[PDB]
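Regression test attached.
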Amino acid sequence: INIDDILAELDKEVSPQQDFSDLMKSWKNERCSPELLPYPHQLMKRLLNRISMQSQLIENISMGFLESKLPLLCMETELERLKFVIRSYIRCRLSKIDKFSLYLRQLNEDENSLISLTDLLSKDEIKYHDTHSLIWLKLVNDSILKYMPEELQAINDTEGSVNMIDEPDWNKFVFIHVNGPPDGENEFGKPCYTVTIPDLKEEVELTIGSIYVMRYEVIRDLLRDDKVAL
Amino acid sequence: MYGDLGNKLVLEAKRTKQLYARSNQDVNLPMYHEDIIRNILKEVSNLRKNTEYLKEQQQLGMLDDKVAKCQYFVTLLCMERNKRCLLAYQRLRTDILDSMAWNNNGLDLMSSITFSQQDTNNLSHQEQEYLKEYCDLITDLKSGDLVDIDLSGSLVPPSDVFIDVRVLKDAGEIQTEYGVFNLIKDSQFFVRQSDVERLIQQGYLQKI
Amino acid sequence: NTEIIKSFKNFILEFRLDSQFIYRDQLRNNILVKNYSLTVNMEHLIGYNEDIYKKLSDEPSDIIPLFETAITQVAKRISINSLPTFQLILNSNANQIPLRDLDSEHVSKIVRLSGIIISTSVLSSRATYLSIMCRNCRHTTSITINNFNTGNTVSLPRSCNCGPDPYIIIHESSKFIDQQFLKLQEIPELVPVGEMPRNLTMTCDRYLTNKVIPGTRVTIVGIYSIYNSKNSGVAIRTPYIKILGIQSDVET
Amino acid sequence: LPAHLQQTFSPEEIQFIVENEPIKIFPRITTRQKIWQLITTDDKALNNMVAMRSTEVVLWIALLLKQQSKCSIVAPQWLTTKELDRKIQYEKTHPDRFSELPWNWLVLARILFNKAKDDFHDPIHELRGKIQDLREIRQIKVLKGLKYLNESHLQLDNLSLLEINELRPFITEIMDKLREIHTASL
Amino acid sequence: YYDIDDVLADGTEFPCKFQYDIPGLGYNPGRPITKNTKLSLPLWLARILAIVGPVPFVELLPPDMFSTKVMNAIKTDPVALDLHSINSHFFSLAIKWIMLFSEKELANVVSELLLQRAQELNHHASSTSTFLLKLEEMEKEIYKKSHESYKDTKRWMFK
């Protein structure tokens, strides 16, 4: 005898908290992954249109008031606390353009692997990316490549050694805390999730409770689908 | 004594990585070592002098010899080994000049050509023009966000909104933005953390 | 003997200054490095309780070997096989007693002093825990000595009748420690205008050996004790300082 | 370019995450109404409070109001001398597990004891006695759990958030050298 | 190579001999280098001459760094054995030696030496040591990465 569905009809007869839980979730996933994750291009237009709205309303109240100095120092605290997440999220990606600045140009001259460049990067990072590799090549060109032979002029893929690909490294060990929603789709058993199947081994079967340490390559699928967290 | 100058430039560079590492800054980058550069650059002119020397002689006397193809396969390599020791050195000197333009230049100064990086002599002519254009690349970014004008500093998380700030021996009553401060020596304050982070980095107000 | 362990066992677990408590963080970091000692500041004893230091100041020879077994019952609350007896090293600063005025009143009392070290010696072996078997009965036992008062204060028994002292030490199952035998001369700025500078001889335990080079300025906290060897009088003893804790300066 | 640590969380960015989880307070300023308002973005309710009637706010506001003494932080369910004794006697009789920690294990034992030390039941040698005791039992099994590491897999079933942000740069720099030997030999 | 630990590893010398005859030496006596001559080569150079040659140029004889003395001294006691005296680098080299040789019997020895020195850089990173003198130069990076993480947690917990 289940009354909950009959109770669920009894009462019926985008939310601003959920955006902040996604900025906090996309920030923790950023700092520990080796590759460059696709940028959240749709929600982060709302927050920069939500910050500039309220920052006038603080100036409009605090100038427009002139006994309660306590509400005016809570909203001043929170705005300078939401500001710190963005200022340490944008400034964390710009330390990963300055390692894979050369590997990403390979991904544009190639025709078909993933041509995103607008969901992989933001609007103004591509004003950073073009003008950085230009300004770094003009330093090496007058200090080394003045005395350049015909073979060793450019640095794109200098095979004959290990170098000049950059290796966004696909086997760094990461720390994951697996948290997947059950049926109440790919779950093999009652408490637990599916085999991650590495190359040489058996099932390495996840659960939903415990946390694990495993390679980044095998769980690259489940980070797109929001069933694990770092 | 064939690629020995590669092992003297690299071990020279490992010192500067370990002045940045533990506790201290790398204010006063040591020097641009140039006399070991000219000794490397002399040998890559000399190793070009042999690979064109054998190019005429392989069409007259050698006539496409496989043992003679080894010299094209050996003298190619010492061009690579001295290329790699010359890029490992000038990328390591670049990122410290990348961080120094990212912590204490353009922070409540808004045009700081002089007054910071007080050497201006340990850099070459090419590394002193790379830096000065790079600081104009930053100010493009802080004009299209408006999260905060000059988003650069303060990667410490915010806490304890009202702090105590004690003046350490620097008079001037200098500040005009957000009100004058009427700054006298040795007199502590009770102001909020938004207006002092632009002055706590100048070595100007000591206490947190 | 009884329950004075529990009055000290609560001192290591519960002593606490403002935020971070010391003697469960100095006991844990000295096991991972395998250092096996502890350093008690002696001002923190009398702030916590005065009745403990009243016993320690009166009769120190019988109570410091009771605190050494009160530590090794606490290090088995942290590690969980071979944990030896820990050593107690203490230091303080009350008032220096100069080397010239050491009367007959300071026998078996905690005394600190100062001076210049002349010479050292070669290391040796003292026994802590040895195994005995009788020659005729072959009845095995085990004598564990922990107290240190140099010749003989604890020896072999006389019966387990059998003969005079039927006991043999077996060298295949025992444990041993080190001794160092320094010498110490008074500082020449407390000038003996008509005298020569005197000297004393100390002993050191297992974890203070090879710590100091000859020719330094030290401050030494120890027990002024006595021993009666004949190696010149009638019923004459000789003085020596059993060191427990040498607080040298920076060696420079 | 952060360039200080750049791969871990520094432990001032761990007291920033734990300050987003709600607790209960006993307020001392009503401001309900009878018949100016806090209009923040992330919480935006509980303008309506009554004197001494429990409500649930986020943690970073309830440290602003304790500094002026207009609130009183209640204890959670675990700061109890009757409750932490079961979570110790679980640890001795199961030498392979981790007993249970509410994942704000160490962090909520710091920000409450320094700031709100008038609202418990006798913190002197009753709660700082257990919490330091439960951190030294737990830091034995971590030390015995590293003689058994491999190059494919590991299980760390129930650990806190501060006992991990001191242990990342040891494991992921060693287990990246056990991967590059087994796969370089193949 | 943008890492400085990778560039410095190539400069080591290896006792490797020739197979052919070459009329020229950039190093001096007698420009025709006779075959069956033994030289010490840098590892940037004797790493591409062991492949390109079906007979290659260089025989690449085994060194004393992987002789039976060192392979027996690290099965007895991996803790108190020197690794700063052999040359200076061990793990960045013994990875390179495995790829050019494909030996399955060395990778079961270095994978046990690495675990035994791993368990004693977690003990000595709890805040009077000789272990700053006998560590490997690949381990001195993770020792300064670990000891400056426990210090910044024990700093934060007490004021």
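Expected vs. actual: identical. Chain C touches chain D through ten residues (CB under 8 Å).
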